[PDB]
Design a protein around this ligand. Structure first.
Ligand code: CL
Ligand code: NA
Ligand code: NA
Lengths: 217, 216, 220
């Protein structure tokens, strides 16, 4: 239904001790990163937000994070979902803490929101009040600054990003040009917490406007 | 069934009147681009042809044109389809004129055509008699010159492109190396209108030939 | 079930005699690339291995080879599968021999293997004893050198690759970072034949290990 949360799910979790030199080199790991935590899930941008939160709760860095082509609904295998993330830390203890924090966030009630009856249009309008080390690096902002994390399907996102930019004193940090691997689009916007919230609200309203009247021009 | 039109459908259309500077930058718009026209549909190359047609009698530029991964049949949301296009113009009125032209073309009877009994193989063989500003730029020809816009699934397209090039006095301008985002392939060929027509006919026949004997 | 072969299937095969010069240029064909063999199939990495074999068996080069987005299961048309390969040679006969060698290999018993009961996790762990001209070029090794060709879905692959690198005296030549077009991941590793074989076995076991307990420590 409209305004329902689309529930995100974790599919697979694994820890590696004493990562191989070859893999460390290929992943451009820092010397302290001896352990890796792997995770996959069926919702990419929620998971990216979750991994960022994990960098606040534990001594881990996000060293790999990528989306799958055509989204979770089109996965051909059980554990692929639509995202893989890799946390790195000095030992399995730090990594375990980071994975647990990631899991907790994914199960916290955050998620994409449905814009219609059969949940075939949905969006993400998440105000991150304090970034961790991953989304702050992605956006090119100081760790701890706020972000509006806005994602919707391609036309909805372009229309709604424009509305969001006009509604608040925010800057465009990163543009996810359509298509992302999952055939969405969006942006990371920064500003005061107030400004990011205003942008989130305006984005949500604008996506809903297009969902309610897709051919109205 | 074979030779049936695969009807293209427009899914969403919206106009942005006074585009924000932040978006103008990320989209690399020109200073005279004040308004945007957004469109999505369930068939990309038809939409690209329609956008180009819109540039012919309206002051609009195609500033964004991208296809969706794995095509319209694999779309996960209702309005994504398999293409997004953005027109930019001096005003919302002129953008609307541009979109009106685009929509008219998409509904004109152009489209992908089925090559077999269950429509599981299809192709585009469109003679663009007179290009606009978009496809002429893409192919590297003069606005107003002709193109054969040829698209099919990957093996069929390679086989049929060779057939078209042998059949007609045309040059390859742009090659859509397999896979495009939709897992198709094709090319833009240029030449006289009669040569592009001869290319189109030969392409269609060759795609049909492969569909009829894919392992021979 | 676990250890079942996922049978690879060829969907289309065609020969172009005397390719038009216009095509020949865009495909980056060489003066002796006068004719083309085209093949599509529903399994990409087995086809890449097969095309590499063809370069040993016949006077052909692999001039084009790409995977389709989101894999064969999501193909929208009948013949797209998840891979297109193009062989080129001096004559239709050498291309014909090339394609015959490709087809022979694809039906040889090679393939992805299931890691679980419903075959929803699968992997490729192929020891190429002696590379042809295609995979050697891809890996940056000399033709004739051995490779472990390792592919699995993203988490399984990252885990099992790291396991294979620890298990055997191999080096990573090429990393297929997740996602490939098919939403898999893997690598080409080189070393002696026995070492590549050791990496393959280690890769396969590590993928099976994840498949048998996808949620790791959450499940203990
Ligand atoms: Cl674990
Ligand atoms: Na699908
Ligand atoms: Na079974």
């Amino acid at each position: 239904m409209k305004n329902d949360l689309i529930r995100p799910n974790v599919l697979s979790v694994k820890i590696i001790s004493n990562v191989s030199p070859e893999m460390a080199k290929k992943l451009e790991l820092e010397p302290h990163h001896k352990s890796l935590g792997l995770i996959t899930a069926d919702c990419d941008d929620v998971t990216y937000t979750a991994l960022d939160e994990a960098t606040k709760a534990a001594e881990v860095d996000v060293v790999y994070a990528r989306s799958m082509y055509a989204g979770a609904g089109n996965a051909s295998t059980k554990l692929a979902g639509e995202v893989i993330g890799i946390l790195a830390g000095p030992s399995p203890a730090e990594v375990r803490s980071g994975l647990n924090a990631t899991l907790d966030f994914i199960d916290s009630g955050v998620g994409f929101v449905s814009a219609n009856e059969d949940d075939s249009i949905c969006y993400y309008a998440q105000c991150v009040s304090r970034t961790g080390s991953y989304l702050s690096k992605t956006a090119g902002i100081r760790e701890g600054e706020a972000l509006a994390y806005l994602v919707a399907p391609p036309l909805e996102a372009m229309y709604a990003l424009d509305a969001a930019l006009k509604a608040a004193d925010v800057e465009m940090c990163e543009f996810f040009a359509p298509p992302t691997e999952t055939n969405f689009a969006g942006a990371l916007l920064t500003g005061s917490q107030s400004a990011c919230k205003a942008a989130c609200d305006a984005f949500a309203e604008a996506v809903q406007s297009v969902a309610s009247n897709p051919l109205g021009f």
